[PDB]
Design a protein around this ligand. Structure first.
Ligand SMILES: [K+]
Ligand SMILES: [K+]
Ligand SMILES: [K+]
Ligand SMILES: [K+]
Ligand SMILES: [K+]
Ligand SMILES: [K+]
Ligand SMILES: [Mg+2]
Ligand SMILES: [Mg+2]
Ligand SMILES: [Mg+2]
Ligand SMILES: [Mg+2]
Ligand SMILES: [Mg+2]
Ligand SMILES: [Mg+2]
Ligand SMILES: [Mg+2]
Ligand SMILES: [Mg+2]
Ligand SMILES: [Mg+2]
Ligand SMILES: [Mg+2]
Ligand SMILES: [Mg+2]
Ligand SMILES: [Mg+2]
Ligand SMILES: [Mg+2]
Ligand SMILES: [Mg+2]
Ligand SMILES: [Mg+2]
Ligand SMILES: [Mg+2]
Ligand SMILES: [Mg+2]
Ligand SMILES: [Mg+2]
Lengths: 181, 260, 62, 140, 48, 129
RNA sequence: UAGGAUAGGGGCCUACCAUGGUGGUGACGGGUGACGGAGAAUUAGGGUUCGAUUCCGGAGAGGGAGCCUGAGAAACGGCUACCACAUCCAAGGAAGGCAGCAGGCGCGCAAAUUACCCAAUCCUGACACGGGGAGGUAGUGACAAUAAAUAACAAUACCGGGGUCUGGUAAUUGGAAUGAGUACAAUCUAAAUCCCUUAACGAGGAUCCAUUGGAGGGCAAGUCUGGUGCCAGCAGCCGCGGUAAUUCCAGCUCCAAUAGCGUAAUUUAAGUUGUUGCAGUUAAAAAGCUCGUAGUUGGACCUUGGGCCGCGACCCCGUUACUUUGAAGAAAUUAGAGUGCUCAAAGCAAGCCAUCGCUCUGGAUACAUUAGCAUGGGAUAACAUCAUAGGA
């Protein structure tokens, strides 16, 4: 026996049943361009996560409002949706969880929030800035653009202290240029 | 197989040990002893996983070979010694004494006890019958044989045993209205008073227990352990006081603690 | 990740004899309190088998 | 009508068991005749090129499909394997190792080629696609 | 049948070398180009 | 032969309601049909009904109010636990807002919502909506 | 029935006796490319298919058989013999069992190093110490899975659109940014190595150059150019190719997915197996007709009302199905609570202004057919009775 065999893993996305439908291709490309995604799989995994959350919410809506599992798991689901900024305060019911779209999840990415915070000129500039290790959430630098930012962590998105845009020293391009000068 | 198994695969270990899935291929197989393998907490687990005194298997060996650990007043050097319910674990160097009780989630918890309270354990009488020479003798579920027991003591009774003198100093008759702790099943660690005993000829006997807050639960006779005469247990209980909480109330407690 | 801070574990023994008794050998070798004996496990195994083939005090000369 | 009684579970189960044999897919799977096929239930098989042959297409089409006659090694069964990719018959020689595969319709003949359900995929250890695209060369 | 004509057309076809062109951006940038072309700007390959 | 008198009663009522009839006669009568009709009347899907005693299996004359879309039996009377009521309602009811499944339970003959309210399972008699 | 034997029940065996036992509710036999289960894939629900493999149970150590020792073996890294292979020999003999680890032939469509180590987990011995191809570490490894580069910005010029404003384009022009890589070092580690961290170095055609399939329809994308001319070839299917080929061979361009994609059993699609849920006048399909056993299915009828207190209660030694509740139904897997491994797939951790410590830190919960046990219910239904009640 190898102990490593017991580590779990799973798939994060599915491919569409119809590969070449014009309407779906246009909608996916519109979302990808709006949020600077690297491929369709990044949107497909968000759709996969939304599908699992929606299935959970629907299954508790098909149970009584006194069923102790619906009180408990619906409270947990609402806490998770409020924690990541996916739901407002007035939207405090399991019904509103069913109304969530992949747009709501894509709007909470570190790339989208870095772009909307003014730190980057474009969504693609935000993507490169995050992948260049210039962005920290709290004290932790995050080089992963699909990072889902909590509302309590939104106000702590900032330039890295080791980055030239965050008080750090100049990068190798600038330093080499001044050394040439 | 052609004989006894010497190894316990880690996946096949008791779930109340809370052993992690990727810590290795193996779990400590409990040695034979006073308690059953599936219902005990081995000494190595207590020393390394629970008390954090040792960090490795070898460190547990080093601690135990120093003769630092006494189980129910006696020095044990076996790491897989099957310490079980109500056992006294004493370390007479740091001056700390532990009674192995169950929390309401079915997991053994080392409960700190006073020096005087570590001088006795509670044992459950398994059977009373005549031994050789016609001498009456008592046996318990923790493997002890006591000769010349009080004739008023019957099977399923709880006796109070003084570890220093090794005699029955007091006992409790298994009656309706005595506070009990469930030691097996899904209600393990729950504390309540017996309301009635439903007997069925030829099969297991069902005990109906109601806790202090009013919740009612039922369990077999083999999973009931009397801990006090009346509504006052003879030992101290862990923080939960044997009152199981639903996950909603646990979430309420967590929310209140986070808010504070 | 991202640098700036590190985490590890530390032990401080009350005296050097406690450490030489309770500490694993490789950590003492790391701290210079012991010497690494260079051995090949496979060579030990082969020598053990060859010597198990022999009986008596002539085992050492084989 | 069909039986509906609460006590008629056996009738329903036995009827379904007997009627499943009418389905072609079920009977193909559970008859055991697929073990008598040339491939004997395997996706691919290796074989010896016995001789290069050209077999005419169906009536509407007019072409020589230029297949290969292959003797399998696992069971010694002779089959006809199509050689795709214009010009790839010249990569095929007698007494040469070839990896055959299915022609994609599960033993059913494909396209205008009559009686052929096998294609050559690899020759002398080199894929036919690589030889067509000149990514690799056939060993001497 | 006759196997002599195997490879006829592909051998007859004159060899035309591929133009050495600029590479297109690869990954997120390629999706950016496609998004711009079909959302901020006849089929895609119309012979106009 | 007559195998299920409830089926004949419900099918005759359904046909009469589709035909626009304001009265339907049920023969034979039975306690299960009167108990199904009481549930139907309680939910407002039928009006007055009258048991006619003929010193035999009786007759029922039911007033129809045009509020019936369909009523039918489920045969066999499958065992339905409280937990399978959701699956049965999804199978048979037009929506989760309207419609009733009639169950025979040891607590009595009742609609599925009332069965949920007392947490009693049983067997399915039929449905109406 | 009586013995014998065994650790012990038992036709397990023996002696005698009787004629039983199973079977369309499928015995017996045959097939299985059949070890069983936990489970796995796909699943609206129902379902279909798989389950050699790390957890549990069983079985075997070339095939049989028989044993010794021992608490425990019908043991095979123990013995004895036969069968089949097969090794050394001085020909007199002697020694065998990789379905352990690695590795090698062979077989094949099909699968890695004759590495290091007991540091972890744990086991074992006279034992704190030895040993462990259990197990771990590294190597090979596009099985499978997770995250994620291959550029970003600005100015000129163009095209614009909404002169101005704002958008997209250029191997244009500029400075910024950075990791792939290299490498001090530290860290890692049993020792190494990888990762994480980090000096110095490391981008312009940022050649630090992304591919795999396609472009008639299904089905996203060309009725562009050259060649071939029913040939060569393509084509899953329908079809294309005979001189103007949107389909072959190529170039250009475009399309899909993208560090991946193409090709060759099973699920879905399939309400084309249908219990939910298909059909049977003419499309495939009502036996020529009737009787008839088993099976399946079987009319109605029997304690209801009522009020009171107060949703419970009150008042005026036949079974079973079914349902309800409880206890069980290993873990892992699944669902799911908590938790910022930087995210994630994961894991079962952790968190706390920094604490010689603390939070009793956490390490939930749900599900789990059928069969078994127990509790309440008796509407529905099954079986058994059901005018010598000859009742008490
Ligand atoms: K055994
Ligand atoms: K016996
Ligand atoms: K006998
Ligand atoms: K022994
Ligand atoms: K070890
Ligand atoms: K040891
Ligand atoms: Mg006998
Ligand atoms: Mg087999
Ligand atoms: Mg298996
Ligand atoms: Mg096999
Ligand atoms: Mg294997
Ligand atoms: Mg096994
Ligand atoms: Mg064996
Ligand atoms: Mg073999
Ligand atoms: Mg043997
Ligand atoms: Mg061996
Ligand atoms: Mg062995
Ligand atoms: Mg590249
Ligand atoms: Mg099209
Ligand atoms: Mg072309
Ligand atoms: Mg049909
Ligand atoms: Mg006809
Ligand atoms: Mg016909
Ligand atoms: Mg009836």
């Amino acid at each position: 026996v190898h102990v490593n065999f017991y580590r779990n893993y799973g798939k994060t996305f599915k491919k569409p049943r119809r590969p070449y439908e014009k309407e779906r291709l246009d909608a996916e490309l519109k979302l990808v361009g709006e949020y600077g995604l690297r491929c369709k799989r990044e949107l497909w995994r968000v759709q996969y996560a939304l599908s699992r959350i929606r299935n959970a919410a629907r299954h508790l809506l098909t149970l009584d409002e006194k069923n102790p599992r619906r009180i408990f798991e619906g409270a947990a689901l609402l806490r998770r949706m409020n924690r990541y900024g996916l739901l407002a305060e007035g939207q405090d019911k399991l019904d509103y969880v069913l109304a969530l779209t992949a747009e709501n999840f894509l709007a909470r990415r570190l790339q989208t929030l870095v772009f909307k915070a003014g730190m980057a000129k474009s969504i693609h500039h935000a993507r490169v800035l995050i992948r260049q290790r210039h962005i920290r959430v709290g004290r932790q630098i995050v080089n992963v653009p699909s990072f889902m930012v909590r509302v309590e962590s939104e106000k702590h998105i900032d330039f890295s202290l080791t980055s030239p845009f965050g008080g750090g020293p100049a990068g190798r391009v600038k330093r080499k240029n001044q050394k040439k000068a | 197989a052609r004989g006894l198994k010497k190894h316990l695969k880690r996946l096949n270990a008791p779930s109340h040990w809370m052993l992690d899935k990727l810590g290795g291929a193996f779990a400590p197989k409990p040695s034979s002893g006073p308690h059953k393998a599936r219902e005990c907490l081995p000494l190595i687990l207590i020393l390394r996983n629970r008390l954090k005194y040792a960090l490795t298997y070898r460190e547990v060996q080093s601690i135990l070979m120093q003769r630092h650990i006494m189980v129910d007043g006696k020095v044990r050097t076996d790491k897989t010694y099957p310490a079980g319910f109500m056992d006294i674990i004493s370390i007479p160097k740091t001056g700390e004494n532990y009674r192995l009780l169950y929390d309401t989630k079915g997991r053994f918890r080392l409960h700190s006890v006073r020096d005087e309270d570590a001088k006795f354990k509670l044992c459950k009488v398994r059977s009373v019958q005549f031994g050789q020479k016609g001498i009456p003798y008592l046996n318990t579920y923790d493997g002890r044989t006591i000769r010349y027991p009080d004739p008023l003591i019957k099977a399923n009774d709880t006796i109070k045993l003084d570890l220093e003198t090794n005699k029955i100093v007091d006992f409790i008759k298994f009656d309706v209205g005595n506070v009990v702790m469930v030691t097996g099943g899904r209600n393990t660690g729950r504390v309540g008073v017996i309301k009635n005993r439903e007997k069925h000829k030829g099969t297991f006997e069902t005990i109906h227990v109601e806790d202090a807050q009013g919740h009612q639960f039922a369990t077999r006779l083999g999973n009931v352990f009397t801990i006090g005469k009346g509504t006052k247990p003879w030992v101290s209980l862990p923080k939960g006081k044997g009152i199981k909480l639903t996950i909603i109330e646990e979430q309420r407690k967590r929310d209140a603690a986070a808010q504070a | 990740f991202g640098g700036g801070k590190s985490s590890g574990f530390g032990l401080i023994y009350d005296n050097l004899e406690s450490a030489k008794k309770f500490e694993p050998k490789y950590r003492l070798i790391r701290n210079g309190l012991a010497t690494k004996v260079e051995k090949s496990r496979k060579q030990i195994k082969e020598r053990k088998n060859r010597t198990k083939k022999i009986r008596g005090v002539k085992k050492t000369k084989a | 009508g069909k039986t509906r009684g609460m006590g008629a579970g056996r009738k329903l189960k036995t009827h379904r068991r007997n009627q499943r044999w009418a389905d072609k897919a079920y009977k193909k799977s559970h008859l055991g005749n697929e073990w008598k096929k040339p491939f004997a239930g395997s996706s691919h098989a290796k074989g010896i090129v016995l001789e290069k042959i050209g077999i005419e297409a169906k009536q509407p089409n007019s072409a020589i499909r230029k297949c290969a006659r292959v003797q399998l090694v696992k069971n010694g069964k002779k089959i006809a394997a199509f050689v795709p990719n214009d010009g790839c018959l010249n990569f095929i020689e007698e007494n040469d190792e070839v990896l055959i595969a299915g022609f994609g319709r599960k033993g059913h003949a494909v396209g205008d080629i009559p009686g052929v359900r096998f294609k050559v995929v690899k020759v002398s250890g080199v894929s036919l696609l690589a030889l067509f695209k000149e990514k690799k060369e056939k060993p001497r | 049948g006759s196997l002599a004509r195997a490879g006829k057309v592909r051998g007859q076809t004159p060899k035309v070398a591929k133009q050495d062109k600029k590479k297109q951006p690869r990954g997120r940038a390629h999706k950016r180009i496609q998004y711009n072309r079909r959302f901020v700007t006849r089929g895609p390959n119309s012979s106009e | 032969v007559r195998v299920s008198v409830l089926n004949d009663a419900l099918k005759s009522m359904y046909n009469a309601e589709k035909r626009g009839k304001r009265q339907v006669m049920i023969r034979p009568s039975s306690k299960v049909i009167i108990k199904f009709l009481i549930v139907m009347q309680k939910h407002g899907y039928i009006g007055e009904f009258e048991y006619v005693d003929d010193h035999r299996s009786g007759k029922i004359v039911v007033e129809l109010n045009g509020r019936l879309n369909k009523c039918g039996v489920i045969s066999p009377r499958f065992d339905v636990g409280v937990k399978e009521i959701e699956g049965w309602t999804a199978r048979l009811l037009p929506s989760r807002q309207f419609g009733y499944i009639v169950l025979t339970t040891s607590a009595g003959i009742m609609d599925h919502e009332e069965a949920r309210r007392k947490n009693v399972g049983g067997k399915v008699l039929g449905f109406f909506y």
